[PDB]
Ligand binder design. Sequence first.
Ligand code: SF4
Ligand code: SF4
Ligand code: SF4
Lengths: 85, 85, 85
Amino acid sequence: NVPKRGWIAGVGGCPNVGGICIGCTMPGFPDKFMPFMDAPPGAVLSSNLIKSYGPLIRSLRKLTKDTLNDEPKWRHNQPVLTTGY
Amino acid sequence: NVPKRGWIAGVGGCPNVGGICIGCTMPGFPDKFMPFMDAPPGAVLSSNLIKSYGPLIRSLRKLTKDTLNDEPKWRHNQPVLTTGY
Amino acid sequence: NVPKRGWIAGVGGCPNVGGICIGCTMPGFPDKFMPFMDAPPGAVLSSNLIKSYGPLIRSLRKLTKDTLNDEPKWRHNQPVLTTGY
Ligand code: SF4
Ligand code: SF4
Ligand code: SF4
């Protein structure tokens, strides 16, 4: 739970901070994880997994974000109130 | 950056601890987000495709996990060393 | 070429105006097409095709459309020209 909780005062961690998780809390440690800097064989399948939907969902998110980066029209210094009141 | 950063000394935040993010930092806040306790229109979309490969990746992870939840055979109190030394 | 071409002076046609195509120009007409009001067998395939990229493509389109339904900010009757001139 290190990443979810941090190391000390929420300050540290491993992957959430740039450190590969080497499985140091598991019965299989360390032998079933070495070499540590190699990709887990199961990960290559999931990293070579194909998300054709990967670029779409990102493009849709950006659009939605852009409209959220636009204040409503009724916020101005014009002498006539547009807020609907 | 609140969830990534926490609120005070990494203690709190919003979604990371069960509070929906109401986009209080966005120029569109709050009108483009209300009503807050309703699902955002574009959410259900990305949900319905990952459901085809969720239970798969989930099982594939539960299995490797179990292998990692097993100590190497050479860890015992038998009369003879079997670690490879 | 009827729907692409219209029937008379580009006015009528068949499926383009709600008339099922019954293959009346084809060497197999009418036997390989009856019963007419039944769906084509091979058609049923691409019809029920589980293209779950669909609800995501219409959304990605509606979001683009909505932005194209907003005039740029510099269109207004304020005492200050703000087009970039
Ligand atoms: S390397 Fe260890 S301390 Fe770090 S996240 Fe993994 S199991 Fe936890
Ligand atoms: S509700 Fe606000 S403080 Fe919280 S994560 Fe969202 S933008 Fe940040
Ligand atoms: S029913 Fe006949 S005229 Fe109409 S589109 Fe089909 S081939 Fe053309």
